[PDB]
Structure formats: C-alpha cells, structure tokens
Ligand binder design. Structure first.
Ligand code: HEM
Ligand code: HEM
Ligand SMILES: N=C(Nc1cccc(CNCCc2ccc(-c3ccccc3)cc2CN)c1)c1cccs1
Ligand SMILES: N=C(Nc1cccc(CNCCc2ccc(-c3ccccc3)cc2CN)c1)c1cccs1
Ligand SMILES: C[C@H](O)[C@H](O)[C@H]1CNc2nc(N)[nH]c(=O)c2N1
Ligand SMILES: C[C@H](O)[C@H](O)[C@H]1CNc2nc(N)[nH]c(=O)c2N1
Ligand SMILES: [Ca+2]
Ligand SMILES: [Ca+2]
Ligand SMILES: [Cl-]
Ligand SMILES: [Cl-]
Ligand SMILES: [Gd]
Ligand SMILES: [Gd]
Ligand SMILES: [Zn+2]
Lengths: 403, 400
C-alpha cells in the first residue's frame, strides 16, 4: 500500500483504499499523466458493479450480510436477468449520490459530503417537466443567499430511448459573444453554448454578464430553449472594501455554481442528467474566472487602476492585483449575504476530511493539482500533503457534449 | 503517444519522447502517485545506451569513433568492474542530467553549465578545496554562473565520497526544552551532527553551518567555510522601512550537494551543482513554510493586517510583500535572482525548444507551477508528462 506523507507535520499514512480502485486512470509505470484535464477518451459486468454498490449501501447502514442485504442482491440479480437492467431503491439513490460526491478526487469541498439534498426526478417525462425540476432545484439551493447543497437526478439511461441531457455546462452561465475580431464579449468559456442558444432562437444581448437560457433535451427530441426567471438567479455586484473605483468596473458574478453536464454513475447505472450545486470557493471566481488570460482577463486593467508598475514582472503587479480581486469577491459576497468560502478555510476543512476518511475508509482519492488553490498554493495545508489519485464508484464522470 | 494540451492557447502537441522512458515511475493504471516527493551485464547495457546518445548528439552515430568507444568500455569493465568517462562524455552527461530533470523550472539554461572534473580527488581536505573553488567560481561577486563539480564515482570494494550537508550553504537549526527551533528547522539533523563532530555552535537564526565532508571509508571531517566565500543578502523592503529590522537574510548561492549523478550506469554520489535562486524558493518556501522559518504571521502583524479571519487574505498579502522584499534585496545587492513570472515564461520557451529537439520534455507539474500565483503563470495551463530519462539526478539515502 502506498505510503503518504504530510510534510508540514511529518506524519505518515497508508492509502489502503486505492487498492480497491475499479476503473483505470491514465498513468503507467513509464509516464504519469496526472496533470491532464481529461484523462480519458452487458449483464455480467452490470451485475458485478451492482453487487458491489449494494454491498457498499448495506455497509454504510451497518447491516452487511443481513437477510435484507442478501434479498436485495437476489432481487437485483432477478431484475437484471429478466430486463437487462434494474432500478435503484430511493434510499440507494440518495446514498449513491452522496458517495459519488465523496469519491470525487478533484473536489476540495467534500467535508460536506453527507449534507446533500437529493431530489428524485426519475419520473420526469418531458423537457417542460425538466425545467420545473430545475427551477425547484435553483430555488431550494439558492435559499436567498444561504446556499444549500443539492442534486436533482433525472431518469437513467436505458436501451431503446434517448438520454435526458442539459446542454449547458452549468445552470447559470454568462453569455460569450464571439466578436468578429476573434475577441469575445462576455465569458469565453461559453462561446459554444452561446451560439447554440442563438441558433435555437434565443434573442441575444450584448453585455458581459448576460445570463444564458437553458437548452434542455428530453429523450429523442431536439433541445428546447427555456429562460430562467430573473427572480431565481441571484447575482452579486463586485465592489472592493477599500478601492472605491473597483465598483465602477461593473463586475458581477452569480451566487449558485450548479454543474449540469457531468454523468452520475451508481451501481453500473448511468444518469446523464443529474445537475448538482453547492457554493463557491472564492478563488474560482476571483482567480480563474476573472483573471485567467482566456477568461475575463481583467488582471492588467485592475493593476493599472491600482497604479502598479506593469512594465516589469519583478514588481509582482500580477500577484498584487489578483489578491485585491480575491478580496473584492469575498467582501462582495459577504456584503450580499451569499455563502462563499475562501481558499484558506476550504483547504483547512479538506485536511479534516482527509483525517475523517483515513479513519472511515483507510484513504481518500485526491487530485493534488486540483485540490491546491490557484493562488497562494504553499500557504495552504493541502500543498504539503501527499495525495493518491484513483477512481472509485459511484462517481461523477465527464461525458461528451451532446452536439 | 500522449496528447498534451495548453488550455490558455488551445494548442496540442504529442510527447513522443516519453516512449523512451528508461526507468519506471511510481504510478500505475490503478493509482497516480505523481504528488509524492520520493517516488556485470547490467552496467554494460546502460553504458552502451549512453554512448549511443552521445555520438548521436554530435552527428557521429554508428561511425568509426563510435565503435572504438564501445569496445573500450567493454574491456574496462572486464578488467576493473567499472569504466572511466571521457572528459567530453562527462560534460555531455552532466548537462543531459540537468536537461532531463523533471522538477527543474530553470532548464532553459541547460546548455550553459561549467563542469569541474574532480575525479582525481582523494581526502576530504582536497574535497574542501574543490568545493571552495566551485563556490568562488559560481558566486562570481554575485553574477552567478551555473556549475557542477564531479567527485570520484562509486566503485566496488571502495567506500564513497559524500557531502553530508544537503547544500553547500545552510543555516543551522537549534532545539530547546520547549521543542522549538532557533534557525532553520530543516537543518536540525545536520546541525547536531556538526556539533557532534567538533563544531561549536552559535545561537543565531542564520548561522552558516560548517561542511561535513566524507572521503572513502574515513569518518566525515569538519571544515569551516571562509566567511568571504559565503555571499549573503540582508533582506529589506523597498517601502516598508520596518522590514529590515526583522533581521532576515538569505545566501546568494543555491548549491545542492546531496543528490546522486548517474551517467551511463556510473554513479557519482558527490556531484554538487549550483545555479541561482528563483525568488519564491526563498520568499515563499524557506521563509513562509510552516515547518521552515514560518515568518508569515510576524510580517502580517507588522503590516497591521487583520489576522483573526482568513477571508481578509492576510496570509496572501504578507507573502507578496516578503517576495517583493526578496527580489528588491537581491537586485539591490547585485545578486542574480529570477522571479517566478520570468522563470515560468522561460520554461514555456524551453518546452517549445524541446518539442522540436527531442519530441517532448519530462516535466513534473506540481514542481514547475510556483507555490504562489500558480494560475497567474503560463505553466499552470500547460499539461505535462512526467517520466525518467538517463543521465539523471537522483535522490539517495543519507550517509548516516
Ligand atoms: C458545498 C460546497 C462545495 C465546494 C466549496 C466545492 C468546491 C469545489 C471546487 C473548488 C472544485 C474545483 C472546480 C474547478 O476548479 O472547476 C470542485 C470540483 C468538483 N466538485 Fe465540489 N464543491 C462543493 C460541493 C460539491 C457538491 C455538492 C458536489 C456534488 C454533489 C460536488 C462535486 C464536485 C465534482 C464532481 C467536482 C469535479 C469537477 C471536475 O472534475 O471538473 N462538489 N468542487
Ligand atoms: C540556473 C538557474 C536555475 C534555476 C532558476 C533553477 C530552479 C529550480 C527550482 C525552482 C527547482 C525546484 C526545487 C525546489 O523546489 O526545492 C529546481 C529543481 C531542480 N534543479 Fe534547477 N534551477 C537552476 C539550475 C539548475 C542546475 C544548474 C542544475 C544541475 C546542473 C539543476 C538541477 C535541478 C534538479 C535535479 C532539480 C530537482 C531537485 C529535487 O528534486 O529536489 N538546476 N530548480
Ligand atoms: N464550487 C463549485 N465549483 C465547481 C465544481 C465542479 C466543477 C466546476 C466547473 N469546472 C470547470 C472546469 C473548466 C474550466 C475552464 C473551461 C474553459 C475555459 C475557457 C474556454 C473554454 C473552457 C472549461 C471547464 C470545463 N471543462 C465548478 C461547485 C459546483 C457545483 C457544486 S460545488
Ligand atoms: N535554485 C535552486 N533550487 C533548488 C534546486 C534543486 C533542489 C533544491 C533543494 N530541494 C529542496 C528539497 C528539500 C527542502 C527542504 C526540506 C526540509 C524542510 C523542512 C524540514 C526538513 C527538510 C527537505 C527537502 C528534501 N527532502 C533547490 C538550485 C540549486 C542548485 C542549482 S539551482
Ligand atoms: C493543465 C492543468 O491540469 C489545468 O490547468 C488544471 C490544473 N489545476 C486545476 N485545478 C482546479 N481546481 N481547476 C482547474 O480547472 C484546474 N486546471
Ligand atoms: C506533497 C508535495 O509533493 C510536496 O509538498 C511538493 C509539491 N511541489 C513542490 N514544488 C517545489 N518546487 N518544491 C517542493 O518542495 C514541492 N513540494
Ligand atoms: Ca421495479
Ligand atoms: Ca521543559
Ligand atoms: Cl465557475
Ligand atoms: Cl533553498
Ligand atoms: Gd480608498
Ligand atoms: Gd505601528
Ligand atoms: Zn501519475
């Protein structure tokens, strides 16, 4: 078992959980591909995945080997033999969604993994009904700024019928209008989905923070366009506690991060539409979304307004401007009473999570490059913690864009 | 051939050089261990592989001189059990081992390296002389120059040359009855060893350690570095006048002395090399790490920051100003230093050069991305492939 060291404390653990990893990652003894973003391109193997998951469920409730456990295994075996597939019990769906979050190697927020509201939308039958489920999710999760983690699970993939899909990468996203110069107005991350919305009849704006409509796909149907009710989309105007001109930049961000394009896998069943939401870590907005060169790219503009010397790297003007942008995000969200966590508190809670999981399961899959925040890396405890990355199921997985 | 993407630009390359990865790393299809710090006819086969590398690099592949060199090493190892590198082979081997080092962000410089051949060495006193000339050459009154001194290779039946110090210049670290450390906690072990082997200690936070040099099969011997050989930089801040009163300092020359150099199956356990510092090594890791000098909260108190909530980003503001102090102080003292923005930009150019030269470049993302301002540097957005090529710099157990 791999020996794992914390270099701040000198302490040593062994990740025995990794030995149970099912699916394979991209690394070999010859070359490590741990830094790649996308590390990746029935009845018998369905059952082995289903049996393993049922075994996980009955362990979680301290009832392994019980009569109920044996009967549920036999019951899943019979449904798979008769129909080629099976259905989760309500309780198994709730457990499986929490487990998938718990298993997600790139999530620093997993201290919260047991506090997840699971909306069962498996009886959904139309794109219009999808939209109602989505609006109820956003209302519940937003909670007028007191954010609450939630996941809505639409029907599973099954033979003879198309998938439910949410085409948008997140429930709330800003338009990115590809200008003719090859530039972008708005968020360059969303140029594709923006052009698809327009092509599907959306009348576009011309702003930098235009909320996109939803493109929702019901089985064997072209996507359908739905506009979010403005009262449902909580947004935070950005201002700085001591730089009064900062508010004149006209920056904003939205309250609720709600990823809608990943696939949820539980016991071999696949849910291609299962959007989930929590709350933001402030570096996601302040450092990546606003300062990445290929996103809003505001770093130079802020530094010039701060009267920093932008003609030499050695002044550290980039570092200084980024710090103040991160202060603005945190100040602005706290002022608006919208839940947010800074990267110091988030990584401290992740260290606690590693300690809990070492005790509970003997390890924790963790992707160091994603867990370490994009600023102030070695000023947080996770930088000094060795991590082991592997794939457990249930899981959230990437999946191709449906177009 | 792994497909490698830059997410800032969208450009794609393929790493065809990872196919030649000679040794085996720690990762498997089951689990990635990329974040871990420490992951006869045998000698002849590595020796042959290196010779072909060498003659390929000078466009002499397979020809007259290539065959002659292959037969010499064969007869050498038959007679003695090892073999001697030609001086040019040794220079080529040192440079390649740097070029191949996945965790080094400074490899744009790999072709410019002064190699000091100390293979004719015996006794620690001569070791000390080679090291002192290395230090004087590399320091060069603050205009730093990259250098490596190569001491005799390990061979059977004979002991080893070792430099017990992890670096040629290190500050001592002393413990007390409250368990804490005055000085550098990283050097508590070597400091008590220097104390055992003669050295009488100081009681400062920046006492330069003596050298514990080990000649084959003798005990290590205790040598003091002449103070004018050790260039140091007192740290001040361009605008925070109280920063100087903190009394912080660092030394000019980063000279790693505890890694093993491996060339063509030969192993040199004492081969100290030096370059110059990247500012974050000093201002973020050595001064701000919690298990190092750990001065971050001291600076924040001096800056009148709000230290009772993390969301004020007092740690981040204090770290930037410490890195500003480091850069300003080295530049004012006319000592070579590179900030992490310039350094990562140059590594990007290195990646492009190596793509054309060898079809790839082994790189360890966790070590190439700086410990502050990660995503503000271009390397953060660059996917990288990590693998082991030879010649190489390798970790090795401590002598004790
Ligand atoms: C409750 C507060 C939460 C916080 C602060 C948080 C934080 C984060 C952050 C910062 C990332 C990196 C994302 C990026 O850089 O683009 C991430 C990734 C991720 N999170 Fe969490 N998260 C939270 C809740 C959740 C919940 C409720 C779920 C699902 C039920 C979840 C599942 C995931 C997954 C699957 C990833 C990986 C995304 C990928 O691979 O691209 N997280 N999280
Ligand atoms: C000339 C300017 C140079 C710069 C700016 C530079 C920078 C760096 C940095 C920042 C690291 C990370 C080390 C750490 O975090 O402790 C590193 C590692 C390394 N460097 Fe360079 N370096 C330079 C020259 C050299 C030279 C001349 C050699 C050898 C001839 C070399 C070989 C290595 C090796 C082997 C490592 C990995 C060491 C380890 O794993 O601890 N570097 N370098
Ligand atoms: N707190 C949160 N956060 C979070 C969590 C998971 C995933 C994400 C979003 N992950 C985005 C990765 C990314 C980054 C940039 C670009 C991109 C940039 C420029 C152009 C094109 C694309 C694309 C992607 C997705 N591949 C956020 C939460 C959301 C939900 C619960 S918690
Ligand atoms: N510019 C440079 N830099 C650089 C490059 C390579 C290697 C290193 C040193 N790598 C440090 C590894 C390290 C540091 C601290 C501690 C430690 C800290 C606290 C307590 C105990 C130990 C342990 C280790 C290795 N285990 C620096 C150059 C040096 C030479 C040419 S360029
Ligand atoms: C190339 C590299 O893998 C890529 O930029 C990664 C690095 N670490 C990350 N970490 C997080 N949390 N989110 C990201 O999008 C990324 N991007
Ligand atoms: C746990 C982790 O591997 C360890 O802290 C590494 C991470 N990246 C690093 N990168 C550099 N340049 N130097 C280091 O010491 C480390 N430490
Ligand atoms: Ca049924
Ligand atoms: Ca006592
Ligand atoms: Cl986001
Ligand atoms: Cl150092
Ligand atoms: Gd002001
Ligand atoms: Gd004062
Ligand atoms: Zn790996």
């Amino acid at each position: 078992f791999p020996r794992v060291k914390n270099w701040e404390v000198g302490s040593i653990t062994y990740d025995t959980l990794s030995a149970q990893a099912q699916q394979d990652g991209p690394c070999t003894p010859r070359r490590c591909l741990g830094s790649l973003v996308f590390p990746r391109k029935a009845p018998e193997q369905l059952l082995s995945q289903a049996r393993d998951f049922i075994n996980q469920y009955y362990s979680s409730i301290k009832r392994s080997g019980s009569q109920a456990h044996e009967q549920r295994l036999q019951e899943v075996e019979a449904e798979v033999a008769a129909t080629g597939t099976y259905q989760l019990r309500e309780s198994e769906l709730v457990f499986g969604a929490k487990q998938a979050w718990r298993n997600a190697p790139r999530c620093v927020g997993r201290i919260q993994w047991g506090k997840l509201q699971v909306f069962d939308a498996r009886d959904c039958r139309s794109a219009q009904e999808m939209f109602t489920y989505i609006c109820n999710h956003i209302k519940y999760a937003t909670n007028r700024g007191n954010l609450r983690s939630a996941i809505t699970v639409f029907p599973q993939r099954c033979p003879g019928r198309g998938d439910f899909r949410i085409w948008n990468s997140q429930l709330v996203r800003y338009a990115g209008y590809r200008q003719q110069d090859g530039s972008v107005r708005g968020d360059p991350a969303n140029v594709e989905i923006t052009e698809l919305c327009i092509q599907h009849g959306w009348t576009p704006g011309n702003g930098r923070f235009d909320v996109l409509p939803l493109l929702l796909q019901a089985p064997d149907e072209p996507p359908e366009l739905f506009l979010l009710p403005p009262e449902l989309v909580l947004e935070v105007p950005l201002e700085h506690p001591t730089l009064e001109w900062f508010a004149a930049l006209g920056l904003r961000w939205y309250a609720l991060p709600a990823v809608s394009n990943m696939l949820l896998e539980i016991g071999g069943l696949e849910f291609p539409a299962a959007p989930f939401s929590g709350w933001y870590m402030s570096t996601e907005i302040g450092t990546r979304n606003l300062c990445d060169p290929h996103r809003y790219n505001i770093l130079e503009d802020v530094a010039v307004c701060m009267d920093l010397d932008t003609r030499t790297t050695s002044s550290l003007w980039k570092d200084k401007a980024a710090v103040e942008i991160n202060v603005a995000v945190l100040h602005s969200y706290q002022l608006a009473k919208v839940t947010i966590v800074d990267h110091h508190a988030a990584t401290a809670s992740f260290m606690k999570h590693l300690e809990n999981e070492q005790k509970a399961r003997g390890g924790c899959p963790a992707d160091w490059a994603w867990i370490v925040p994009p600023i102030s890396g070695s000023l947080t405890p996770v930088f000094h913690q060795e991590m082991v990355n592997y794939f457990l199921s249930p899981a959230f997985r990437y999946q191709p864009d449906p177009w």
